[PDB]
From Swiss-Prot, chain A:
Disulfide linkage: none
Gene: PSMC5
Localization: Cytoplasm; Nucleus
Self-association and partners: Component of the 19S proteasome regulatory particle complex. The 26S proteasome consists of a 20S core particle (CP) and two 19S regulatory subunits (RP). The regulatory particle is made of a lid composed of 9 subunits, a base containing 6 ATPases including PSMC5 and few additional components. Component of a complex with USP49 and RUVBL1. Interacts with PRPF19. Interacts with TRIM5. Interacts with NDC80. Interacts with PAAF1. Interacts, in vitro, with the thyroid hormone receptor (in a thyroid hormone T3-dependent manner) and with retinoid X receptor (RXR). Interacts with ERCC6.
Taxonomic superkingdom: Eukaryota
Stated role: Component of the 26S proteasome, a multiprotein complex involved in the ATP-dependent degradation of ubiquitinated proteins. This complex plays a key role in the maintenance of protein homeostasis by removing misfolded or damaged proteins, which could impair cellular functions, and by removing proteins whose functions are no longer required. Therefore, the proteasome participates in numerous cellular processes, including cell cycle progression, apoptosis, or DNA damage repair.
Section covered of the full-length record: 24 to 59 of 406
Protein's name in the database: 26S proteasome regulatory subunit 8
Organism in which the protein naturally occurs: Homo sapiens
Annotated family: Belongs to the AAA ATPase family.
Curated annotation (Swiss-Prot), chain C:
Family, as annotated: Belongs to the proteasome subunit S10 family.
GO BP terms: proteasome-mediated ubiquitin-dependent protein catabolic process
Gene designation: PSMD6
GO terms for cellular component: cytosol; extracellular region; ficolin-1-rich granule lumen; nucleoplasm; proteasome accessory complex; proteasome complex; proteasome regulatory particle; secretory granule lumen
UniProt cross-references to InterPro entries, sorted A to Z: PCI_dom (IPR000717), Rpn7/CSN1 (IPR019585), Rpn7_N (IPR045135), RPN7_PSMD6_C (IPR049549), TPR-like_helical_dom_sf (IPR011990), WH_DNA-bd_sf (IPR036390)
Paired cysteines (S-S): none
Protein name: 26S proteasome non-ATPase regulatory subunit 6
Species this chain originates from: Homo sapiens
Species classification: Eukaryota, Metazoa, Chordata, Craniata, Vertebrata
Role description: Component of the 26S proteasome, a multiprotein complex involved in the ATP-dependent degradation of ubiquitinated proteins. This complex plays a key role in the maintenance of protein homeostasis by removing misfolded or damaged proteins, which could impair cellular functions, and by removing proteins whose functions are no longer required. Therefore, the proteasome participates in numerous cellular processes, including cell cycle progression, apoptosis, or DNA damage repair.
Keywords carried by this UniProt record: Proteasome
Curated annotation (Swiss-Prot), chain D:
Reported tissue expression: Highly expressed in embryonic stem cells (ESCs). Expression decreases as ESCs differentiate.
Gene behind the chain: PSMD11
Protein name: 26S proteasome non-ATPase regulatory subunit 11
Family of the protein in this entry: Belongs to the proteasome subunit S9 family.
Protein's cellular compartments: Nucleus; Cytoplasm, Cytosol
Transmembrane segments: none
Superkingdom, taxonomy of origin: Eukaryota
Record's subunit section: Component of the 19S proteasome regulatory particle complex. The 26S proteasome consists of a 20S core particle (CP) and two 19S regulatory subunits (RP). The regulatory particle is made of a lid composed of 9 subunits including PSMD11, a base containing 6 ATPases and few additional components.
Residues of the full protein shown: 369 to 422 of 422
Post-translational modification, as annotated: Phosphorylated by AMPK.
Induction, as annotated: By FOXO4; expression in embryonic stem cells (ESCs) is mediated by FOXO4.
Physiological role: Component of the 26S proteasome, a multiprotein complex involved in the ATP-dependent degradation of ubiquitinated proteins. This complex plays a key role in the maintenance of protein homeostasis by removing misfolded or damaged proteins, which could impair cellular functions, and by removing proteins whose functions are no longer required. Therefore, the proteasome participates in numerous cellular processes, including cell cycle progression, apoptosis, or DNA damage repair. In the complex, PSMD11 is required for proteasome assembly.
From Swiss-Prot, chain G:
Classification of source organism: Eukaryota, Metazoa, Chordata, Craniata, Vertebrata
SMART domains in the cross-refs: PAM, PINT
Subunit structure, as described in the record: Component of the 19S proteasome regulatory particle complex. The 26S proteasome consists of a 20S core particle (CP) and two 19S regulatory subunits (RP). The regulatory particle is made of a lid composed of 9 subunits including PSMD3, a base containing 6 ATPases and few additional components. Interacts with UBQLN1 (via ubiquitin-like domain). Interacts with ERCC6.
Summary of the function given for this chain in its UniProt record: Component of the 26S proteasome, a multiprotein complex involved in the ATP-dependent degradation of ubiquitinated proteins. This complex plays a key role in the maintenance of protein homeostasis by removing misfolded or damaged proteins, which could impair cellular functions, and by removing proteins whose functions are no longer required. Therefore, the proteasome participates in numerous cellular processes, including cell cycle progression, apoptosis, or DNA damage repair.
Name of the protein in its database record: 26S proteasome non-ATPase regulatory subunit 3
Gene for this chain: PSMD3
GO biological process: proteasome-mediated ubiquitin-dependent protein catabolic process; regulation of protein catabolic process; ubiquitin-dependent protein catabolic process
Keywords: Isopeptide bond, Phosphoprotein, Proteasome, Ubl conjugation
Cross-link (Glycyl lysine isopeptide (Lys-Gly) (interchain with G-Cter in SUMO2)): K14
Amino acid sequence: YLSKIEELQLIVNDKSQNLRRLQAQRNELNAKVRLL
Amino acid sequence: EQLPESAYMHQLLGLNLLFLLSQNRVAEFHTELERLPAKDIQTNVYIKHPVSLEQYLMEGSYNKVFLAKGNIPAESYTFFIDILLDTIRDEIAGCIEKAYEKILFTEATRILFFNTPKKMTDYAKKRGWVLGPNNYYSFASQQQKPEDTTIPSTELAKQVIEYARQLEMIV
Amino acid sequence: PKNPDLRIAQLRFLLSLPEHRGDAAVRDELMAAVRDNNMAPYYEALCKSLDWQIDVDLLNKMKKANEDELKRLDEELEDAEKNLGESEIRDAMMAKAEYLCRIGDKEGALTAFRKTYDKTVALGHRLDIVFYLLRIGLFYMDNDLITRNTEKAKSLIEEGGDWDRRNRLKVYQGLYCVAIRDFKQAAELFLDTVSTFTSYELMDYKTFVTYTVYVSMIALERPDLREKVIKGAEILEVLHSLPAVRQYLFSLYECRYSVFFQSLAVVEQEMKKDWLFAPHYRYYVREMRIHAYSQLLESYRSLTLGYMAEAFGVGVEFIDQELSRFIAAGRLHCKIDKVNEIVETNRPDSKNWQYQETIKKGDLLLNRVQKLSRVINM
Amino acid sequence: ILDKKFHGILDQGEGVLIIFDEPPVDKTYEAALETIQNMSKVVDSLYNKAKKLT
Amino acid sequence: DLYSRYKKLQQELEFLEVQEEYIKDEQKNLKKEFLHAQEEVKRIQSIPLVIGQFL
Amino acid sequence: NYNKAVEEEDKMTPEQLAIKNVGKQDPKRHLEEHVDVLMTSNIVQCLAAMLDTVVFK
Amino acid sequence: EPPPPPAPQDVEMKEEAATGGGSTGEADGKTAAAAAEHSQRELDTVTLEDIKEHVKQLEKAVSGKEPRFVLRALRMLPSTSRRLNHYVLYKAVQGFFTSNNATRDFLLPFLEEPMDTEADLQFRPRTGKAASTPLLPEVEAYLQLLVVIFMMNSKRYKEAQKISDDLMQKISTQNRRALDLVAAKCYYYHARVYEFLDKLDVVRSFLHARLRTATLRHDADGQATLLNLLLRNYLHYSLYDQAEKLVSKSVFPEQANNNEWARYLYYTGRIKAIQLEYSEARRTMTNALRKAPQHTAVGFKQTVHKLLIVVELLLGEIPDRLQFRQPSLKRSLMPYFLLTQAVRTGNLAKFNQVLDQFGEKFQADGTYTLIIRLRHNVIKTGVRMISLSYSRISLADIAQKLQLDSPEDAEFIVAKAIRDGVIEASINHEKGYVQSKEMIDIYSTREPQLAFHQRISFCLDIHNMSVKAMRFP
Amino acid sequence: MSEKKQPVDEDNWDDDNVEDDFSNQLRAELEKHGYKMETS
């Protein structure tokens, strides 16, 4: 079960993606500040 | 644990304790007092005389060493308190000169026995120091009043460099 | 209705420190127990001091007077249940019922506290209740009720402003403070000595002056010290009555060595005889000492203890352990010496000692919120 | 020097009996006075903190 | 059925690392445009002023 | 001066912070010009303390 | 007898309705490594079950949930939710129908019933609950006679759940972490089953093998739950296992539950107590002390503090315990206020009276390494107090004031103090003077500006903790 | 989550600080310092 488990531990990196969605929220923050 | 009993059953732990204390391993000392804790207090005076001898090393060493050598009826402990005499003599060699001002020849004659070997002469020259007649000064130490002039001022700004990197890694 | 049995509470304090005697108990025990229908000042002292031979002609005539008082209660509140006014029952019976609490135990709780607390909106009756929890926290020497009357009085501190009696609240909150080692707020709230002229919970107003000067001689730095106890205008007469009090202040401000201890012997005699102060006789005395040595030891730097012991009295080994305990106790930083004998002083906390408390709080309290910061995920 | 003051500290071996001082050190003073109240503000936010979770 | 899974999600992960590196410098450059906006605010009062009173 | 005199009114508002989310109305930031002015100030003047080691050796 | 039919019908149904019906949403919410909103809630209600009115606390008719919820333990098309509603309507076997008790007798075929009913449709915390909650809330019967192996059999069906956990569902179950949480608590029930009478000779090499199956590949919360087992049972049953850590020391990536991380730091600080390393230990035991503020009113924080502050007494300095004194702690005399009272004194008769008189409570201490150097700490406390008080002192004062019978024994004490760096003294080795002295320059020239890198490193790391806190929503 | 090994195993409370100086020391304080006048 080589890549049968590698892909699972890379499914864990969807929780890395919540940090990215947070960063996208950070860039969306101050976007309306500069547009104001 | 269900084994028959040998005559050396506890003084083997005593010998192990004595070499284990001589070898300067104190984690080994506490796992010696922790591998079989409760029985070490009362039985086997070849535990209590070494652990109270550790107490004597703790609060009053260089007073009870030869007087403890005077009580081993089972001659296998003097071999390892010769090693403890070696850790006595190196600590003489670190703890009667180059930490004091001056001592006269008779204090070295009392503590450093046999009153003039090449052994206390070896120690007096092992300090890196030349003796006079009937005296042992402990001078010529802790020179220049050192300060480390401006180097932390430089290198802690080199720490402020990665502090600016910590201003960098966040937005 | 307060001060006689409050003075008998001071007689309970007279039961406190002389313990070995059972005659100064019984003399004014009988004197306070034959006067004015007081069942409890010999009932708790029956529970504490000597018991009774009998009480039949001795004090059951006063339980018979209690019976007469009780049957006229059964007259009065049944005559006031017909009347429909300013709660005639609870008013004309809170009078005799606070008097019942003077007669007997804490049943004055049910017949005073809520009996006037469930009707009124004026703070006078509730404050009489606060003053009675004060007097019974002087009876039992409470920690409970002299906080519970604060718990009841702060229900009407939130709207107020009154001339004498709120300053008396300040006085008894300060007595609660310096009933334990709490010292500065007592003096700060006593300091307005004008408006506390005479009310029927006071003892001698001059003794109020002595108590505020005993509490205000310390927790008052030397400019404030001289401005209050020296430049105080109206205070000077009410300390011109007692010479040894003014002598005490001018011996302390004089900053000698032996009149320190003469003065301190006077205030040693004085400090004991003082109720909910006498179990605190020690830290006040060495507090006087630490103020004295602190104002005397910062100024010199080439100081010998021979120069101390030449004028303190004897201190050749007598102040040795004294000053050693004072230094190593945490305070009064100087250096005590071998026979080289040079006492060496320290900084005014302008630069060095100031640099600690910032990280001392940013460790502790900020580390509590580090724990709450580590409450995110699990 | 005991009772009153002019910052006249004693030295038995100088001559001048040196009076020197630095009065403005309010840089640390006002910050310490801030931290005294800021710890109280953290305490008074701790109620919101410990209450809004559970 | 496995080999299709990390051929999708690995590509998703490296695309997301691509934009996760980009958005940092995005939010960085926004603060420079914000400082230009700050100077544009600050230069509204330099040489004149015409004192009135608030009514 | 320019920091601390603004900092005490920066720390006044946690007196008035509360709960009932919209039932309070005064959200204003307070960290402005005490992050960045202090950052630029202290970092440039500690490099000014570095000038002596930079120029001098 | 009418009041105990309503209450379990309420609370047990609000347990499993939320538990099962939300774990279904939690495992059909295709990715969730954090969410688990009924997992930790059901753990908050099972720790509450240990307070509350159990699976059935033989509640005065028949104890009937045990012949109820493991029959037809099969989660098919949602008419089996109606089977659980039939297990709601059938809760009155106790009151309506013939009352059959099947605890401790027919629980073994009931332990065979989650396999005797059809295939588990990938919801193992219902079956993990069915392998834990029957008999582990029957540990509180405390009999542990012939039910030791019964509770162990319930944990054998937990091991069947480990079979179905890390031998089945080979695509990213993520209730593997929830079952780590459940399996941790039932490993503490392995403790509560073997360690009442034996050791866990299964779970010695299976402690290491459960660490193996949760080392890196699916390790989350399992590492330090198993390490608290590893660092707790390996205290009474002996040591050097802490030294077995010392070449493979590995902790969490992110700090876990605050109580968990607190008590873990407490265990490793208590191990560093016997290691006599006093530098890291004081701050980690302080962290553990302030980090666990929630405890039962019988105590246990005064337990943790009692067995905490002994080496803090052994430091040579310690604050007064006037901030920890509890009345039941006063009756149980656990850290001995008298001991630290004698620490502040230079007294020997009362201190050794504490020792000899209170060896009965030193039994409960079990840390007899305190005394053989804590007498040394008494004499070091005396010389520290005196030498801190005095500027210059001689051997003629202290060497006989503390009755060391000789100058040179106090010279050796001061030699070990200078070896500890405590005093800055010198001995005139001519006439018999300790020509002691004090060093200079206590001003803030060089020292606080260098300590401010510790201060500001503290500050910037808390900045970055605030940043990582900002990173989660 | 609370237990895990442990279920098996103003007043004078602030005055305790200087009371540590009152119990081991100075209980006959002005019975000797008050007698410094006439002892010597």
